[PDB]
Amino acid sequence: QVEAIKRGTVIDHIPAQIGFKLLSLFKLTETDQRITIGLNLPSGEMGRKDLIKIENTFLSEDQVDQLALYAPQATVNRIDNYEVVGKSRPSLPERIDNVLVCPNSNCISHAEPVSSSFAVRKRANDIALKCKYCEKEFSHNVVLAN
Amino acid sequence: QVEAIKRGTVIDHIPAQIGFKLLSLFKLTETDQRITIGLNLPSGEMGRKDLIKIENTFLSEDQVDQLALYAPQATVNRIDNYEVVGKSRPSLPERIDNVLVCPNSNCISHAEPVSSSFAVRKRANDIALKCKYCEKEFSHNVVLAN
Amino acid sequence: ANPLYQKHIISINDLSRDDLNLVLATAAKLKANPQPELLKHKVIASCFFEASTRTRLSFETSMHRLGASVVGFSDSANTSLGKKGETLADTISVISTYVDAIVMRHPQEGAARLATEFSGNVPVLNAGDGSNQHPTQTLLDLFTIQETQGRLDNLHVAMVGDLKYGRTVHSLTQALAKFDGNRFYFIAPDALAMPQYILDMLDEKGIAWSLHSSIEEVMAEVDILYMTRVQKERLAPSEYANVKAQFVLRASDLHNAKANMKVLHPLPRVDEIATDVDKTPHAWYFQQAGNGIFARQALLALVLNRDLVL
Amino acid sequence: ANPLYQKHIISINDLSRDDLNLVLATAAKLKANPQPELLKHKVIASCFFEASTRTRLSFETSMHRLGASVVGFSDSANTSLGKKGETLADTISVISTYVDAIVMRHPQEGAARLATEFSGNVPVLNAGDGSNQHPTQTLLDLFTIQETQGRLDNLHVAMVGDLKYGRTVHSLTQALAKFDGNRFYFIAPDALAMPQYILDMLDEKGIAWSLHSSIEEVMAEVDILYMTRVQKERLAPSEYANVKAQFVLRASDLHNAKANMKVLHPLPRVDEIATDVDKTPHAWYFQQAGNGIFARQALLALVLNRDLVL
Amino acid sequence: ANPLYQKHIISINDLSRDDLNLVLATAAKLKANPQPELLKHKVIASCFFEASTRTRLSFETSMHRLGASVVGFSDSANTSLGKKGETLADTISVISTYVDAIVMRHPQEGAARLATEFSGNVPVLNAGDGSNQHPTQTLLDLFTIQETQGRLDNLHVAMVGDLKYGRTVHSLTQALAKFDGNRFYFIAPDALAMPQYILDMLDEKGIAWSLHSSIEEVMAEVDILYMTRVQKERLAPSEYANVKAQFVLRASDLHNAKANMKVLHPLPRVDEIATDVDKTPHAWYFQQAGNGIFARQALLALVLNRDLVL
Numbered sequence A, B: 001q002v003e004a005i006k007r008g009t010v011i012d013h014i015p016a017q018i019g020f021k022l023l024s025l026f027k028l029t030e031t032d033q034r035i036t037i038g039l040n041l042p043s044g045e046m047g048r049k050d051l052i053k054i055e056n057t058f059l060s061e062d063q064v065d066q067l068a069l070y071a072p073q074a075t076v077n078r079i080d081n082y083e084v085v086g087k088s089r090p091s092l093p094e095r096i097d098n099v100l101v102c103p104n105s106n107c108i109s110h111a112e113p114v115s116s117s118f119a120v121r122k123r124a125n126d127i128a129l130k131c132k133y134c135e136k137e138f139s140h141n142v143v144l145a146n
Numbered sequence C, D, E: 001a002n003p004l005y006q007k008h009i010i011s012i013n014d015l016s017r018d019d020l021n022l023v024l025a026t027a028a029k030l031k032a033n034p035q036p037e038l039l040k041h042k043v044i045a046s047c048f049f050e051a052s053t054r055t056r057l058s059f060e061t062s063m064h065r066l067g068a069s070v071v072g073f074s075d076s077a078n079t080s081l082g083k084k085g086e087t088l089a090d091t092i093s094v095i096s097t098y099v100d101a102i103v104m105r106h107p108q109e110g111a112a113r114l115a116t117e118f119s120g121n122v123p124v125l126n127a128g129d130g131s132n133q134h135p136t137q138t139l140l141d142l143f144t145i146q147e148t149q150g151r152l153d154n155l156h157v158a159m160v161g162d163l164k165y166g167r168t169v170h171s172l173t174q175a176l177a178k179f180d181g182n183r184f185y186f187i188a189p190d191a192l193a194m195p196q197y198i199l200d201m202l203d204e205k206g207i208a209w210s211l212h213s214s215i216e217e218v219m220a221e222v223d224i225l226y227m228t229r230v231q232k233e234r235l236a237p238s239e240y241a242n243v244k245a246q247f248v249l250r251a252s253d254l255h256n257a258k259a260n261m262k263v264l265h266p267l268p269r270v271d272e273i274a275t276d277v278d279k280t281p282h283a284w285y286f287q288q289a290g291n292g293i294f295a296r297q298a299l300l301a302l303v304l305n306r307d308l309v310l
Ligand SMILES: N[C@@H](CC(=O)O)C(=O)O
Pocket: C128, C134, C166, C167, C168, C228, C229, C266, C267, C268, C269
């Protein structure tokens, strides 16, 4: 459609400046597989957006998990033999694995050898994450914040 | 490679695995300018490679040289009206500023409000980085990130 | 066979109304009818990485009154993790090959939770993790309440002092909320106000609570006045303005209270409770602590006994 | 305006065979003909952020011997940088607002260069910056090597001790390298060896140098045996095995010594030079230290006074 | 005998609009026409019982710039008061027996006044006494405010930071209050607010002043934005929440600034003034610091020399 390629998967509707954070925060550039990227691409729906094109690769739950509280409006879709075979939404599980870090500095998750983990109580306002260890809850605007 | 840019810069023939580096290093993506990047791409001259096109953005000759110790082999096409209006090539620079960190822990550069700086020179089959401040010399391989 | 058999006791948050009065029922049974060898050949690890008198001493006494043996330490300065840099994980990993159960109090929140991921079939009991949870404290608290008031329903409860760092009131408020009609009164400095996640939970079950500036404005309505110490070992420098109590309870200003009113405090207390409150019929922090013995005795049996008839 | 007028003297690597010769030339003039008022109406800052006996006292004596007045500190604990968190950049910006020149010693490498970037028109004289450079030390060494050898050429020189951290050898090796036909012997433990950037620099001029493990191997050939103290303050904990001096010059090791040969040491010495060596005629470190007086009046005169001297 | 000859300069509150004008008047004379021997044969004590970079080095440079010689200490740990238990009164009694004047900085409020009661005929110049006064600092600020505004009247001035402990604002507010029609803006946390005795003093003259919570509110109106560092050394543990700077001036906040407006800071600064502000044309704290040189030669000249200057 918008200039596809045999197999692989396209991540469309990425919010501006979030695109590049994905390539890194997800070792996406870790391959010999032809990748195409578009930053600050114009869009008739979000104003401006990012877009990644990973040739001969896929997701499902491996990472479309994080994409949730990241690109709440992104659109991941598989492409086979030049054709979109499945548009997807943000499957945003209530559980998030180790790629994350608890803000409570006195949480034992920092000192000891254990993969982080949060429960995601998605209030319609902002997103809240409760730590599996210290049990304190926060806002994803703090956990994902610098 | 997707499509042609009207005015700006296209860094051609970036080796593979480096294009992402360059993106991370010089914060080339911290802009509102349309950027199209393609990693792993069949070439002919060389095997395959990475490319980075960035709209309404030009590079001084030193800015281009900064690429020397990453993509020694590379072309930088200054583009105006969809046409190459000048092409350049990375020649080793005199110094590399504020992007690298001095490996010497007792260097004054780490504690004070000053930009880093190293003089460049090729020794054996390598380039040595001498810190303007502590005067200690290191193989570019060790001098890192930040 | 009982519901608490072989279970970890980490957070009140993982317990049901039943579990609680199950341990209170056992406690009542045990205080009246003592069972000297309920766990004759058991070895329990008492591990304290923080400081404590009540929780650690009541716990070990409990193990002995039940015929069990105890190992452990009161500080980690001499463990391998204190001198050889060993992880907590590994410490828990090896201790779990020596004991039937591990009781631990640790300075970081979540340490108990982390422990259960390395103790295998060994049940872990949280004597308090940082400022998060203190389950066995509320178990004895609920027992004390049940005792003095004869009910755990629609009571007028007030919690005073440092509510932010009080693992004691964190766990106690979650438990009291598993019961019906209880009204809560929160009297604390704004800097140590009592966490949101607690209040939100109270809203989920839509139950009454409200902040107050003084004790006297709720004195005549409360059945339980739970006093607290300022956790001056857990607070940030940007909060040292709160080291001193703020609300100090004396005998005199206890005149308009209900006759059945009982003054509780997990202890230790510094200045928040004048010693002149001690000779009054309301004072109940010592009797309270004494109940730690029956409550923890009750827990140890339910966790280490498939069944128990008494 | 002489070649050194209003110049920053921070690293020998920035100096030319001519610059050095001009300094020594001047020293001899001033030594021969003291100019008591050469720097009247001058106020120089003596800023030592690290310890010093020789270079700080000689520098100050020099300033008075030329009529300049001095301000500064020998300990940074009572400056604003020491108690109020001020950066060194700001420290230099304000100081450069009071004095005509800044002599400074600092524990971090590059500090003196950092200062030049904030001292505006006020020249900075590097009195030692970490384990990097020590230019005024080299000036006096040369003046001394010259005063007892008759020249700075085709000399055989041994440098033993801590060559990795000796800001003294780093500068002096570079200084002599700017002359012709000098041989170098590096007697030092593997861990504290002369650094690569000095060897590479030597290679570029095809200067002869080689590593030895005893003073004896070269004792007969050497003209200058330049001893150094191990820089315990600079050592990483892992080079601690080299804290104790590995080579100790005793008066008995001077038996087969070129009669012209002299023993030098930038000082202080711990035990690398037995006190019995002090009486031998090859003893010249104290004389060496006294020369610091002349090398420093010289450097001062050239940086704050445009005319060459009579 | 000028009005300031042999006077104690310890608190702006003891000075008159005339006294201040005489000092600045003199500064300009000396700045314009340096008098290198004005204080020949004078020995002044520089006694700093607390840290200092700017005021101690400038004061000493001044004394040399006028031909006076100096004695003293920058650390009280090696005086008899520091190791033998001597009182400060005795310390002053003996010192007043050697010098012609005593410049002193002390960590306790009132120290400089205490000295005047034991220094007999030797005048005492207060270089800072606890969080009270800092007279010579105000002198240079005024000289600076005057040098860049053209006057000391009807100026809009903002003082932000630690106003409670800033001995700097305490003196300067009092100094400007002695002039006419100056507006004041106090941007500071509730805990470190300008003290009452300064406000009351302002009320007495019907001077306009008001509290603000951002630089922006007044950025357009202000002529002088006088930034201060939080006095961590003075803080009671309970004001520790204010250790970190609450207001940070960035170069981007200077967009809507009266072109005449200048940014001042008695220094040192931690982060309240981003380094990007140093390049902007509103940057004047370093110039400000350099003026200290003139304000201090001035004050010195007036206290130890009876005639006005040419
Ligand atoms: N009982 C508290 C400490 C105290 O209140 O003194 C705890 O152990 O969490």
